[PDB]
Amino acid sequence: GSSGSSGQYFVALFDYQARTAEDLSFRAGDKLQVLDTSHEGWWLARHLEKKGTGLGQQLQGYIPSNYVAEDSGPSSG
């Protein structure tokens, strides 16, 4: 949506390898949607890009905001 249904999309500026399961991994240019922002640093986002290669273990998790940014996106469809 635009007003009602939330929608915060972020882009990964650089790569990041998650050490633990809780933490989510990604690469530079990975479309990630921020779900939870109850922490000035680690946000709960999910994988948007089509299924990866192989057997995906996790799709969402705690990811560093600094690593990503606000990538312009079409709110209305």
Query: Residue 12 is part of a domain; what is its CATH number?
Result: 2.30.30.40
* DSSP tag of 76: -
Method used experimentally? NMR
Residue pair 18/64 in contact by the 8 Å Cβ criterion? no
Instruction: Count Cβ neighbours within 10 Å for each residue of 15-51 and write b for 16 or more, e otherwise.
Output: ebeeeeeeebbbeeebbbbbeeeeeeebbbbebeeee
The CA distance from 64 to 56, in Å, is 20
Q: Into how many domains does the chain fold?
A: 1
Print the domain residue range for 48.
Answer: 1-77
Alpha helices in the chain (DSSP H): none
Q: Are 46 and 35 in contact (CB under 8 A)?
A: yes
Specify whether the CB–CB gap between 18 and 25 falls below 8 A.
Answer: yes
- Whether 24 and 63 have beta carbons less than 8 Å apart is answered as yes
